[PDB]
Automatic annotation (TrEMBL), chains A, B, C:
Enzyme superclass (EC): oxidoreductase
Portion held of the full protein: 47 to 341 of 352
Protein name: Copper-containing nitrite reductase
Taxonomic lineage: Bacteria, Bacillati, Bacillota, Bacilli, Bacillales
UniProt record similarity statement: Belongs to the multicopper oxidase family.
Gene from which the chain derives: nirK
Binding, Cu(2+) 15: 165
Residues bound to Cu(2+) 14: 152
Binding site for Cu(2+) 10: 81, 227
Residues that coordinate or bind Cu(2+) 13: 150
């Protein structure tokens, strides 16, 4: 796009603050930012806050979100749809024009691990170019396995295609399929959808821990067969809803936009790959690593 | 096919009548009928009753169906397989030759939302060319959320490929992916798998209602990531069996031939898109709309 | 590969023996063996024991497996990952060099129907070339429907691509998609992933029986929409874990590496096709038959 040539807007931190016992303000940007998705390969991504997937958002079940989008894009409108919320899409998920802001308010009344993404037509173009992320809604009553979990991380799967190519987006296999991790607590990694960072800087854990991953497959196009090598999921909550409780799964099927909370024990020191078991995607970049040490 | 050149047989209405407290007669045709699947694009479909997907069939759990197929096709045999039924496929799902009729009888002893389709080899050819549809079997004891539902519709997803091209059917991406809606009660829309009708004439509902959709992904080839923008499914029954009960899902994973009953509340006036969240398919036509008014 | 030219190593039988009330020894080979995947089409497969998928392994919940791999391949390293086990992947799923042996030990503490496969990079290459199979872990307390089942078989789905072509493995549609059956008890068929054997020598059953299938979709790349024509699954246990219990499903969604125990009644004599309902795959070979006789 001519107005995007040479544009690379520095990442802006997410802003969020609680404004009542059940209300939270959230302010994100829409911005065009170079991301290295594979070694030597820069995708000039359409992003929230300069990250793809965008920044993690976490609220409590029953929170109403007062959401502000500041469109830094010089020429393309953007918008936001959170899958967490009940809202009127033709009122509340509408476009914010270049160099403008818009504020929308809506409730998050269901617990889980929800995709969010731009809702601007063509939505496929916006998601593929990098406008996706996850919002976690914490159940008012937690999960029944909460006492057993020792450590937690968030992982997101997404695809990357040929650069802003709608033909490829609709009809082509993905060029890369990738994991990223978004921070829940200080010290957690916070990375972008690329083929390498979570291999070279693996997630960390300690021998014997029960790990929880909040996961979502944001697509745009592919389903995910989520698997952690060398373990079996003790407990899985589809879409992160506590009611949806499965046990002893080797692999979790995730639709496009599909989330889960999975929990597994790592019993031995060493490095545990984390994959989509659709191995063409795994080979095209969708392998993270978890390093488990006596530390 | 030479005998299909210029053939466009007018749609014939489904016939069905109850003949006992647990027996129902059903009579459908197999016919070759031009359907506009996208603006300007006519697919000379292989159809039941001149619709693709075919007409909706609804029976009660425990009903035995006495099924008659009248093959109006001048040259191609057709047949019918209902996924609802227990039957001998090599006896009961057999071909009916051109210009002949055949009657088969079999029980529907499980509740849910079942695909039906032609069972004539190559089955891929018959389904892709348009020989698919849904039969709903109503649970003897309803669903536990029945009292909460205010309005119901049926939606079906299917793909369309290059015209009667077996190479494309087996190896090619779909050209279109589409929703249609089939009527449950007088006044309900009854449409065909196309890219536009449910956008231009959206399904209707009223602010605050709990909506139930009986859905099925008939394929032939793709899985579906079913999602309704601006809401979360309060309750989902996999394959429409009341036992298979999930809560608070943002998106429902549907295999090829996969069904569900999903229920969600629309809280605000406006237009709610309904998608497969595999966005390449959504962009190739698989977006329906639900218009929610203070009416 | 030059060292594989003209190599066709005769299948070697699986070896397994119990060595304690909760310990079992297992010894498999890695070997290069010509398999006919379709009529006239020989794939020089990378295999365990000369079968693709490899031989069936069955242990009891709580068994520790002492596993030996003898690499007969003249030049390629191989390894083994069982999805059943808790293990350190970077210690326990490591390569065995040509003409060497390696022994690894790890527990199987969860019941179900688990994929196993080579864990040697690129893992996609190893699985696609034929290094996959299933290990069943029998629940300590069986399934709640055990008393109702009259007959059991194992079925595995896998794909075959152009011969050792990593580009095709990653980016290409499968050339064949196939079922095979592995023996649970003397007299059961034991076959390889091909387009024809289970059509020409169908599985056998008797009118009125409840059949259980232990199934797994090993991929490498595709999800499976598993369906048995002319019946509905009475009971399904996702991943073969008794807790994960669904009822009355027409079709079961299986991710890549995904397993299940499904149970269905055949009510009438005749031949029942067994498919992935993603019909492009079915047309490319993924149809088995079950012949049901008054015998
Ligand atoms: O299980 N992943 O190689
Ligand atoms: O834009 N569909 O959620
Ligand atoms: O034709 N398979 O249901
Ligand atoms: Cu309060
Ligand atoms: Cu506010
Ligand atoms: Cu955007
Ligand atoms: Cu969405
Ligand atoms: Cu009666
Ligand atoms: Cu009759
Ligand atoms: Cu037909
Ligand atoms: Cu079918
Ligand atoms: Cu003991
Ligand atoms: Cu030993
Ligand atoms: Cu190997
Ligand atoms: Cu694996």
């Amino acid at each position: 796009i001519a107005a995007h040539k040479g544009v690379n807007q520095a990442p802006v931190p997410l802003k969020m603050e609680r404004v009542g016992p059940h209300d939270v303000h959230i302010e994100m940007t829409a911005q065009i930012t170079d991301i290295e998705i594979d070694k030597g390969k820069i995708y000039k991504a359409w992003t929230f806050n300069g990250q793809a997937p965008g920044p993690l958002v976490v609220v409590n079940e029953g929170d109403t979100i007062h959401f502000t989008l500041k469109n830094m894009d010089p020429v393309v409108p953007h918008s936001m749809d959170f899958h967490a919320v009940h809202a009127s899409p033709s009122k509340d998920f509408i476009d914010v024009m270049p160099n403008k802001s818009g504020t929308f308010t809506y409730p998050a009344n269901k617990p889980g691990v929800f995709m969010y993404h731009a809702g601007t037509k063509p939505v496929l173009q916006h998601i593929a170019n990098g406008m996706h992320g996850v919002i976690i809604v914490k159940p008012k009553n937690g999960y029944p396995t909460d006492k057993e979990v020792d450590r937690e991380y968030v992982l997101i799967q997404n695809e990357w295609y040929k650069y802003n190519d709608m033909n490829d987006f609709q009809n082509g296999v993905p060029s890369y399929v990738v994991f990223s991790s978004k921070a829940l607590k200080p010290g957690d990694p916070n990375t972008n959808g690329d083929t390498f960072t979570l291999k070279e800087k693996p997630l960390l854990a300690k021998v014997g821990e029960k790990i929880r991953l909040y996961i979502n497959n944001v697509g745009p196009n592919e389903v995910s067969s989520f698997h952690v090598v060398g373990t079996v999921f003790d407990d899985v909550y589809l879409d992160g809803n506590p009611n949806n409780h499965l046990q002893g799964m080797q692999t979790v099927m995730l639709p496009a936009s599909g989330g889960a909370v999975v929990e597994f024990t790592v019993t031995r020191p060493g490095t545990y790959p984390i994959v989509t078991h659709q191995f063409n995607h795994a080979q095209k970049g969708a392998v993270a690593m978890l390093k488990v040490t006596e530390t």
